[PDB]
Amino acid sequence: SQFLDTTRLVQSCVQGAVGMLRDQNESCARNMRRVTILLDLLNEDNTRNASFLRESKMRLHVLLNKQEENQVRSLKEWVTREAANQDALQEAGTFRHTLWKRVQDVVTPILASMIAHIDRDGNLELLAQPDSPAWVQDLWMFIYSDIKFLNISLVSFILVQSHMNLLKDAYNAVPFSWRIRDYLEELWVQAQYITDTEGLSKKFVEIFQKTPLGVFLAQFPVAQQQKLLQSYLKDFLLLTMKVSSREELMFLQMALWSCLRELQEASGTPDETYKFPLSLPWVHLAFQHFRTRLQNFSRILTIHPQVLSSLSQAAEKHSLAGCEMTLDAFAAMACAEMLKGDLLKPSPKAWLQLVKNLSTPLELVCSEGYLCDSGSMTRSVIQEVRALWNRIFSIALFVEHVLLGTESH
């Protein structure tokens, strides 16, 4: 309606909304950044920002309408409640300024809770970037234009929480990482309860293709689908496993691309769920089929940080990540080659610490419960890992049994 300039009201409430937000007290304090972002894209100039205004005003409509069913109808009459409020009248001067301050103080915590729910980890900056293509803003204004897929509950000094425990200025590349991840894990639990573990991938991809998010992402062409898929790989890996690097995340993302392509090479030729290999739920299928072979790989890069540098040669000398999950085996090769390169130089004691920390993962990898089935190249690499680890561990047993003894006595 024309009863109140709502755009001026929202732009007035932006600053008081953002000044109530807090992060986890060091997690990229972005208050002035959120102010600049929201005030750049709450205008009527672009049809992008105009449409963002129409759906954001519809979100204020439905959240205030659900908010005011609790009212006792003597607080729904806000003008009459405010004319009887003498102190707010004599604190705001005139009567119309008092009414505008009343609507501002009503909308401001609602706006703050709504921005605290959208801007969960950086979802706003994908609009604040220029030169971002149509899949980004189209999926962002598909998810924000859905009430039932994206609930916004309400509460007063509101905490906005991070989920991806991110670095300096992440801005997660799929327009909402956490809602799609939790929705797909709900679909995972329903998929693995409905069917058995033989048509699980088929039923999971088909129950994804039924939902309105699936039929929204199906109308994208192939290139935007693959770019969203690599973006969802990088941020899903940042969501699940806390990774303290940039290029380790690149190797782990290539590894999960190898896992997904391996799992798509497992089935021969259905070609009805392989009309979408560049689709979201494959990521989850790959993790739920390969979780220990990823998590162990994360631990073998977490105890030993230097070995990544050797892995910084490995894809340059083998051209891996084409068929099968091999980076765990090549990381095993790089760790055993670093231990076979030197044999004596820092001390026996720090090596005992390093071999006792690496004893469990490197022995766990060269076990038939870990290597369930793969290609013959992975088995040849694991056989060489077995032999070289037997050499290194037998030398380690010799050291810890005679050498530290004769270094002690």
Which residues here bind other proteins, judged by CB under 8 A?
Answer: 11-12, 15-16, 18-20, 22, 25, 29, 31-32, 35-36, 39, 66, 69-70, 73, 87, 90-93, 97, 153, 155, 157-159, 161, 165, 182, 186, 189-190, 192-194, 240-242, 291-292, 295-296, 299, 302-303, 353, 356-361
Nearest to 276 by CA among 197, 193, 220, 192: 220
Q: How far is the CB of 295 from other proteins (least distance, A)?
A: 5
Give the nearer residue to other proteins in terms of CB position, either 136 or 307.
307
Q: How far is the CB of 395 from other proteins (least distance, A)?
A: 16
Q: How far is the CB of 142 from other proteins (least distance, A)?
A: 22
Give the nearer residue to other proteins in terms of CB position, either 63 or 314.
63
Give the nearer residue to other proteins in terms of CB position, either 155 or 218.
155
Give the tokens for residue 238. Answer: 């940042």
Q: How far is the CB of 49 from other proteins (least distance, A)?
A: 15
Give the nearer residue to other proteins in terms of CB position, either 334 or 358.
358
Give the tokens for residue 87. Answer: 């102190």
Question: How far is residue 129 CA from its own chain's centroid?
Answer: 19
Give the nearer residue to other proteins in terms of CB position, either 153 or 197.
153
Q: How far is the CB of 221 from other proteins (least distance, A)?
A: 33
Q: How far is the CB of 387 from other proteins (least distance, A)?
A: 20
Q: How far is the CB of 377 from other proteins (least distance, A)?
A: 26
Rounded to the nearest 5°, which phi and psi values hold at 396? -70, -40
Give the nearer residue to other proteins in terms of CB position, either 166 or 278.
166
Three-class HEC string of 295-357: HHHHHHHHCCCCHHHHHHHHHHHHCCCCCCCCHHHHHHHHHHHHHHHHCCCCCHHHHHHHHHH
Give the nearer residue to other proteins in terms of CB position, either 101 or 318.
101
